[PDB]
Amino acid sequence: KVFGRCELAAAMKRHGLDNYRGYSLGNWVCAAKFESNFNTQATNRNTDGSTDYGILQINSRWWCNDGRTPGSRNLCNIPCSALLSSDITASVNCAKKIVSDGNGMNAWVAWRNRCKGTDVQAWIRGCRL
Ligand SMILES: [Cl-]
Ligand SMILES: [Cl-]
Ligand SMILES: [Cl-]
Ligand SMILES: [Cl-]
Ligand code: NA
Ligand SMILES: [Ru+3]
Q1: Of 52, 66, 87, 119, which one is the catalytic site residue?
Q2: Which residues bind substrate?
Protein backbone atom coordinates (compact mmCIF):
# COMPACT_ATOMS: atom_id res chain seq x y z
CA LYS A 1 0.00 0.00 0.00
CA VAL A 2 1.23 3.44 -0.77
CA PHE A 3 -0.09 5.76 1.99
CA GLY A 4 -1.04 9.40 1.67
CA ARG A 5 0.91 11.78 3.94
CA CYS A 6 -1.98 12.58 6.25
CA GLU A 7 -3.37 9.02 6.01
CA LEU A 8 -0.01 7.67 7.38
CA ALA A 9 0.25 10.37 10.07
CA ALA A 10 -3.22 9.32 11.25
CA ALA A 11 -2.35 5.62 11.26
CA MET A 12 0.92 6.30 13.08
CA LYS A 13 -0.89 8.36 15.67
CA ARG A 14 -3.51 5.66 16.17
CA HIS A 15 -0.66 3.21 16.72
CA GLY A 16 1.05 5.17 19.48
CA LEU A 17 3.97 6.86 17.66
CA ASP A 18 3.08 10.52 18.43
CA ASN A 19 5.74 11.57 20.86
CA TYR A 20 6.90 7.96 21.34
CA ARG A 21 10.22 8.30 23.12
CA GLY A 22 9.80 12.06 22.69
CA TYR A 23 9.56 12.00 18.90
CA SER A 24 6.69 14.07 17.53
CA LEU A 25 4.53 12.57 14.73
CA GLY A 26 6.22 14.71 12.12
CA ASN A 27 9.52 12.95 12.76
CA TRP A 28 7.97 9.59 11.94
CA VAL A 29 6.25 10.81 8.89
CA CYS A 30 9.43 12.49 7.58
CA ALA A 31 11.39 9.28 8.20
CA ALA A 32 8.80 7.18 6.30
CA LYS A 33 8.80 9.63 3.41
CA PHE A 34 12.50 9.33 2.81
CA GLU A 35 12.88 5.64 3.77
CA SER A 36 10.01 4.31 1.62
CA ASN A 37 8.13 7.10 -0.10
CA PHE A 38 5.27 5.88 2.16
CA ASN A 39 5.13 2.49 0.32
CA THR A 40 4.68 -0.45 2.70
CA GLN A 41 6.14 -2.83 0.04
CA ALA A 42 9.48 -1.03 -0.28
CA THR A 43 12.61 -3.22 0.09
CA ASN A 44 16.24 -2.35 -0.36
CA ARG A 45 19.18 -4.78 -0.29
CA ASN A 46 22.26 -3.73 1.71
CA THR A 47 25.89 -4.31 0.66
CA ASP A 48 26.21 -6.58 3.71
CA GLY A 49 23.46 -8.84 2.38
CA SER A 50 20.86 -7.65 4.94
CA THR A 51 17.60 -6.16 3.56
CA ASP A 52 15.45 -3.22 4.67
CA TYR A 53 11.65 -3.73 4.74
CA GLY A 54 8.55 -1.61 4.79
CA ILE A 55 7.44 1.94 5.45
CA LEU A 56 10.36 2.52 7.84
CA GLN A 57 12.95 0.30 6.02
CA ILE A 58 13.56 -1.91 9.05
CA ASN A 59 16.66 -4.01 8.58
CA SER A 60 16.99 -7.77 8.76
CA ARG A 61 20.47 -7.80 10.43
CA TRP A 62 18.89 -7.16 13.82
CA TRP A 63 15.15 -6.79 13.68
CA CYS A 64 13.28 -9.32 11.59
CA ASN A 65 13.82 -12.80 10.12
CA ASP A 66 14.10 -13.20 6.39
CA GLY A 67 16.03 -16.49 6.29
CA ARG A 68 18.79 -14.93 4.15
CA THR A 69 20.82 -12.65 6.41
CA PRO A 70 23.71 -14.80 7.80
CA GLY A 71 24.47 -14.24 11.40
CA SER A 72 21.42 -12.03 11.95
CA ARG A 73 18.96 -11.68 14.80
CA ASN A 74 15.20 -11.23 14.92
CA LEU A 75 14.70 -8.84 17.82
CA CYS A 76 11.15 -7.87 16.89
CA ASN A 77 10.27 -11.56 16.52
CA ILE A 78 8.54 -11.30 13.18
CA PRO A 79 9.12 -12.38 9.66
CA CYS A 80 10.41 -9.41 7.64
CA SER A 81 7.47 -9.95 5.26
CA ALA A 82 5.14 -8.74 8.10
CA LEU A 83 6.83 -5.35 7.63
CA LEU A 84 5.43 -5.12 4.05
CA SER A 85 1.77 -5.45 5.04
CA SER A 86 -0.89 -2.78 4.31
CA ASP A 87 -1.46 -2.98 8.06
CA ILE A 88 1.40 -1.02 9.74
CA THR A 89 1.12 -2.73 13.12
CA ALA A 90 4.22 -4.85 12.76
CA SER A 91 6.33 -1.94 11.48
CA VAL A 92 5.15 0.41 14.24
CA ASN A 93 5.70 -2.15 17.05
CA CYS A 94 9.13 -2.95 15.72
CA ALA A 95 10.04 0.78 15.28
CA LYS A 96 9.14 1.28 18.98
CA LYS A 97 11.79 -1.34 19.97
CA ILE A 98 14.40 0.20 17.55
CA VAL A 99 13.84 3.77 18.71
CA SER A 100 14.18 2.48 22.32
CA ASP A 101 17.61 0.84 21.58
CA GLY A 102 19.65 3.87 22.77
CA ASN A 103 20.23 6.05 19.70
CA GLY A 104 16.71 7.31 19.28
CA MET A 105 15.71 7.92 15.72
CA ASN A 106 19.39 8.14 14.69
CA ALA A 107 18.92 4.44 13.99
CA TRP A 108 17.38 5.63 10.78
CA VAL A 109 20.20 7.16 8.87
CA ALA A 110 17.73 8.97 6.55
CA TRP A 111 16.04 10.58 9.57
CA ARG A 112 19.33 11.86 10.83
CA ASN A 113 20.40 13.13 7.38
CA ARG A 114 17.07 14.48 6.11
CA CYS A 115 14.71 15.18 8.99
CA LYS A 116 16.62 15.77 12.19
CA GLY A 117 16.72 19.45 13.04
CA THR A 118 14.26 20.38 10.23
CA ASP A 119 10.72 21.69 10.49
CA VAL A 120 9.14 18.19 10.83
CA GLN A 121 5.73 19.57 11.95
CA ALA A 122 5.31 20.56 8.26
CA TRP A 123 4.78 16.83 7.49
CA ILE A 124 1.58 16.73 9.50
CA ARG A 125 0.39 20.25 8.64
CA GLY A 126 -3.21 20.33 7.62
CA CYS A 127 -4.01 16.74 8.48
CA ARG A 128 -7.09 15.71 10.37
CA LEU A 129 -5.38 13.43 12.82
CL1 LIG B 1 9.01 -0.80 8.10
CL1 LIG C 1 18.59 -15.14 8.42
CL1 LIG D 1 16.27 10.30 22.00
CL1 LIG E 1 16.03 16.03 2.12
NA1 NA F 1 17.21 -11.38 10.84
RU1 LIG G 1 21.95 -1.93 18.94
Answers
A1: 52
A2: 101
